[PDB]
Amino acid sequence: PISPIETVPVKLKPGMDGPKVKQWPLTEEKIKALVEICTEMEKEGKISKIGPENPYNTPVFAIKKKDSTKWRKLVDFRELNKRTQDFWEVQLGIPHPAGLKKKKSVTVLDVGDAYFSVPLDEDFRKYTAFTIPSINNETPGIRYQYNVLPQGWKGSPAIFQSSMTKILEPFKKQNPDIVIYQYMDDLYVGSDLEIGQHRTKIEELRQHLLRWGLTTPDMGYELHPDKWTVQPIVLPEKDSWTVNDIQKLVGKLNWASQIYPGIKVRQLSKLLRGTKALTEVIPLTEEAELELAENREILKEPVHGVYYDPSKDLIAEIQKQGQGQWTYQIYQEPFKNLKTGKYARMRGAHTNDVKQLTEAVQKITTESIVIWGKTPKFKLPIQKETWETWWTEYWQATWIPEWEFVNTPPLVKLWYQ
Amino acid sequence: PISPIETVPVKLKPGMDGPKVKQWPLTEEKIKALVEICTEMEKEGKISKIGPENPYNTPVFAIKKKDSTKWRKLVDFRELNKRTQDFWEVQLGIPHPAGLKKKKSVTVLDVGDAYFSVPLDEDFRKYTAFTIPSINNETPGIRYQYNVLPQGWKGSPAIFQSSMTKILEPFAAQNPDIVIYQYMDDLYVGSDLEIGQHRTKIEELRQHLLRWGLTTPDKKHQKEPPFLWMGYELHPDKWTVQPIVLPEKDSWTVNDIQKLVGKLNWASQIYPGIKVRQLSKLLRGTKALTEVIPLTEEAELELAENREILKEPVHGVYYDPSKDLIAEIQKQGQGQWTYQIYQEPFKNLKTGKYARMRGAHTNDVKQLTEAVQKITTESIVIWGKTPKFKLPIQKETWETWWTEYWQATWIPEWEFVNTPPLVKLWYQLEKEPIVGAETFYVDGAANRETKLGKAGYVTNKGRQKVVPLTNTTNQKTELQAIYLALQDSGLEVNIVTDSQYALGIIQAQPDKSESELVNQIIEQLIKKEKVYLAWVPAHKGIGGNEQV
Ligand SMILES: N#C/C=C/c1cccc(Oc2ccc(Cl)cc2OCCn2ccc(=O)[nH]c2=O)c1
């Protein structure tokens, strides 16, 4: 299009070089799709081919977007983000509303295309370099860099922030109770309205954004954050117990003590005094029921001294509970949980583990965005190469959270369900 | 000059300057030998005699080759190389022959004087300046600099590749019928065109390259198949590795073991069944560089097996995109796995092997999954697609495992081929406590100083045992307790342990390990009809009976 004004100068923290990150091998299918997409973007001026004097590289992937049958290009900007935006969450930083999580419904719209209009600083372009790989190393890859604000770069909405504010200004005046937060390429819109009125208002915002030149490609995607809390730990309830069941109970309670220190197991541990068969039925005493009940009412009331620290990173642990169910905890420090939850989707065996874990990660990340305005670093119960191979199949989002892989779970599986 | 090729702009690293290293040395013997070079290079426009102002400098040596009739100039660019901007990396990996498509004809062209045929960015040229010295007596040295890509300069390979690509494009644009692979200096062209028109096309490419200043073989066709390339023999209808030579020695050296397992690993690409385990297990000790390392019986046996495998030549085929990609895996039994990738029954695209050398405990199913992953990765790299799998495991076994497994696992289209040995779970622990079974409360402990320690059990039937141990740790004692309870119980047994370690090893359901203890425990668990392992927190007085 045109440069409406000059470019916003982009800088890196002094003493920091550009991203150099190897490109993952891709299927011929994804390579072809990337070739088409990038050819079209090259014809539109969005990206340009570069020479060998550009050392930098950033990974690219091909995803199906959400429900669509056509390919989308997804650039992994995490490294460039760490090397730039960490100074740009200050200089250009976008404030995060603490009322968004309190709304009864939150709809997510994709505003990314808006970035393609605005030019990028000439000096900074070389840092956006990416490579379309070739099969079997037959040729060196096809190399491009961005001439416009790239999607996935956290600096893009930071630069486009003023324009977005100006565009959203009229809508906010006619709708003062609607909360609108911008995270990367997405717009989160909260309301207390009835589902129908909420969707009507969302379509109003869509048409408003559309008549101002901002296109958006929009069950549907909508959240309900008012139900989001830290789930209580549950003790198994049975008519008649056994030695084994009581052992499990004492174990789980003793584990829960690391969270809620005011738990006393002394009575339940006595209930089996001598060496006994695991299947031996032990009726609980009065003191045993007293202590179990005293440990129950203390376990349904949330912890003390748990607050979100903006300085520390968010950490999300996920464990596989079997039968399509997964449990997760979001925490800054060990044993202090900011959020916990459980995810399950759909049966029929059409689903597999990797798909479930991927959708779970996406959901947890979206929750974390709505709540704290930033993404947690995941600890994934999956083999590294497996994940790195199959994650782009089911990935529907425009952002990539940080992650690592955990090889050492204990029995904590059934303690979290 | 060589101007028609567009120069690539180059900068020095931020906050640096061209190399100022001054060289007076050394000798009069090689000096005029250097002038005889630099004159002919100056005439060809590759270098230029430079004025007195603002020079930097770089060391220059002269040296000779065998069959001495031609001398050679050598410049050490190390400092300048340190001082120049990073460039996009030249290709790290090379194309794998198993991923190449069969073409009716293949031609290998090699451009000579490659780097010297590509101009260097003007403003940067002053940093390549080198000086031919003298005997003095009021004789300032002869000064030069490069107008082209200097040999040994950091930017030369990348800029050459770029230039070659751009030069190739107007040709390849008008010739989609033929395909040109570009590797270092060499161009490998191939086509399904008839031999005559193929040859004519090759000559056209040669002339096109010659107009850009890039020389190509004028004698015969040059290389004829094979085609010994990067450690391969490339035949028209087949590919193979180089001839592999396994040396025989009385005294094996750590370096020689390195080279040995190197050649064997390389051989595993094509020759199936190669086992690298024992010979590398020797190398597990990384100590010094010169250490003479004695063989083990298993290692000599392994080397012998490999020698018998390498007895006869084996050739792999090329890839046909119209045919399915099949991968087949077999277990070698030692924790070693082997696989073949083929579109056809009697011809392999390639082969390979997988081994888990990390961690003490694992099982066959998990290892099979890992191998499948490695093969999937390799296949995506080479052919750009994932293969159909033929696996020595049954649907029930794997469904059971991955449904019971804590990690998320992924498996593609795969079918059951019944080839012994099959992959199976040798035992399964009970998910619920057994009724009518003796309950063993087991424990073990050790002194971390004396290491003596003990292991034992107390049952609900009133039975008790305490066995003293020597040279052990709390881990070993705690596992020894479970083993002890497995020995003294019936076909159905309930075990209660206070340790997360032992529970962790057993619940992982390993069928093999690096510990004889864990192995014996495995054999016992296999012999048992029902085993229920349960855990309780220690020092809580839940009926576990301990000692110190
Ligand atoms: N130095 C040295 C060469 C190195 C070299 C390395 C890689 C590829 C290459 O040649 C090829 C070039 C392009 C294509 Cl589409 C296939 C090729 O098939 C190669 C397989 N082949 C080889 C020879 C022949 O007679 N027929 C064939 O189908 C040459």
From Swiss-Prot, chain B:
Effect of Y441W: Virions contain primarily p51 RT
Notes on the domains: RT is structured in five subdomains: finger, palm, thumb, connection and RNase H. Within the palm subdomain, the 'primer grip' region is thought to be involved in the positioning of the primer terminus for accommodating the incoming nucleotide. The RNase H domain stabilizes the association of RT with primer-template.
Additional remarks: Error-prone enzyme that lacks a proof-reading function. High mutations rate is a direct consequence of this characteristic. RT also displays frequent template switching leading to high recombination rate. Recombination mostly occurs between homologous regions of the two copackaged RNA genomes. If these two RNA molecules derive from different viral strains, reverse transcription will give rise to highly recombinated proviral DNAs.
Mutagenesis or variant effect for W406L: Decreased RT p66/p51 heterodimerization
Sequence positions that bind Mg(2+) 1: D110, D185, D186
Residues given in the record as Mg(2+) 2 binding sites: D443, E478, D498
Effect of K65R: 10-fold decreased sensitivity to ddATP and ddCTP inhibitors
Protein name, entry field: Reverse transcriptase/ribonuclease H
